[PDB]
Design a binder for this molecule. Structure first.
Ligand SMILES: CCc1cccc(-c2c(F)cccc2[C@](O)(CCCNC(=O)OC)[C@@H]2CCCN(C(=O)C[C@H](O)CN)C2)c1
Ligand SMILES: CCc1cccc(-c2c(F)cccc2[C@](O)(CCCNC(=O)OC)[C@@H]2CCCN(C(=O)C[C@H](O)CN)C2)c1
Ligand SMILES: CC(=O)N[C@@H]1[C@@H](O)[C@H](O)[C@@H](CO)O[C@H]1O
Length: 333
């Protein structure tokens, strides 16, 4: 097949990037985040108790409203760093862009208030490998490969700066409009996860972290860049940032003067200036500005690892290659 189809993404405050997918006949619309860090697709369910407030505020899937719905009903539990969602498995036809697929997805009957009452998205579409899929359910992208409609077996991500297009994901290729130059490709350490070897982390001129090498998970569902607590504690100390309850902050006036942060991947230096990784709401010295970096300790086998999230993707257009098991990087525009 020659097909390459694009899905438009809505950018909410440079934290949450989501798009729309139909489910069933007639299609039921859902706002979903496309996450390379998880392999499962799930949406809120009409069987979700209203005692969970998230199921009131978000859109619910009604199985009996779709004639293509096929019952499964196996228990499913997904674990994130934030907590757990629970539900049961179902199967229906899912539309993404111009592509339709019959897909096994979760129907979530348990949706904790924290985080999900802060979610502008209804659900998640896992772009990860089947190796990470709870219940070993075929991921959506694998079902798309089987259809052989794609021009290529690769898919790419584009995240924009809030201010116009929000963001775009392309299935089957990349969009030259949103990147310049050529892609620099880096192989995955192993199949089953989107992760690449990182040869170190630099603050300004000196490389202060990840000196002997570390893991970098490219995560399209990650809002920030996240490293191990040990790494971050040293990074923020070097930047002079102060730890709040949630975030790391710096005096808003000092933000533009913070040094650059470079990530060394595939022998090349990937730099993020203070303008890239700092939220500047004001430049006043009397206000504190949030940093787009924080600490998250990812448990093995996946961790300990860095996570390169929207902060990183925003500057660098990312191509995910299934056929060759590699990740391309190009300057975003
Ligand atoms: C479906 C992923 C997920 C799971 C749990 C909570 C949230 C969530 C949330 F409900 C409300 C606000 C913010 C978040 C996140 O900031 C990411 C939001 C969507 N990602 C996006 O657009 O990246 C461009 C998360 C907050 C906790 C740490 N996060 C993760 O661990 C996400 C994993 O990297 C991806 N599976 C981000 C999102
Ligand atoms: C703003 C203080 C803060 C710090 C750290 C985490 C949260 C948090 C949280 F606890 C629970 C849910 C969602 C969030 C955030 O989505 C960021 C999550 C990080 N994800 C990640 O690294 O994925 C790999 C925030 C939710 C509100 C909007 N956010 C902002 O950063 C707004 C800033 O105040 C703007 N200056 C993100 C909040
Ligand atoms: C109702 C239904 O189809 N249930 C199936 C079950 O028979 C199968 O063994 C399992 C394997 O994925 O998935 C589910």
């Amino acid at each position: 097949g020659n097909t390459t189809s694009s899905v438009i993404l809505t950018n909410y405050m440079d934290t949450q990037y989501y798009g729309e997918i139909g489910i069933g006949t007639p299609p039921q619309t859902f706002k979903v985040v496309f996450d390379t860090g998880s392999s499962n697709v799930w949406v809120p369910s009409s069987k979700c108790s209203r005692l969970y407030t998230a199921c009131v505020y978000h859109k619910l899937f009604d199985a009996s409203d779709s004639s293509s719905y096929k019952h499964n009903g196996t228990e499913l539990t997904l674990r994130y760093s934030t907590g757990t969602v629970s539900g049961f498995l179902s199967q229906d036809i899912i539309t993404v862009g111009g592509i339709t697929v019959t897909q096994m997805f979760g129907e979530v009957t348990e949706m904790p208030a924290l985080p999900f009452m802060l979610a502008e998205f209804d659900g998640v579409v896992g772009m990860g490998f089947i190796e990470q899929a709870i219940g070993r359910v075929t991921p959506i992208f694998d079902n798309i490969i089987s259809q052989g409609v794609l021009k290529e077996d690769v898919f790419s991500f584009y995240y924009n700066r809030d201010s116009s297009l929000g963001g775009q994901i392309v299935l089957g290729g990349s969009d030259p409009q949103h990147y310049e130059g050529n892609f620099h490709y880096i192989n995955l350490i192993k199949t089953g996860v989107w992760q690449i070897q990182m040869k170190g982390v630099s603050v300004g001129s000196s490389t202060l972290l990840c000196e002997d090498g570390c893991l970098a998970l490219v995560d399209t569902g990650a809002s920030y860049i996240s490293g191990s607590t040990s790494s971050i504690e040293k990074l923020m100390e070097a930047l002079g940032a102060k730890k709040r309850l949630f975030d790391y902050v710096v005096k808003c006036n000092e933000g533009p003067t913070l040094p650059d942060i470079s990530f060394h991947l595939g022998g090349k230096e990937y730099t993020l200036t203070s303008a890239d990784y700092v939220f500047q709401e004001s430049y006043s010295s009397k206000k504190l500005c949030t940093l787009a970096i924080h600490a998250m300790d990812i448990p093995p086998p996946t961790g300990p690892t860095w996570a390169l999230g929207a902060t990183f993707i925003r500057k660098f257009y990312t191509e995910f290659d299934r056929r060759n098991n590699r990740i391309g990087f190009a300057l975003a525009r």
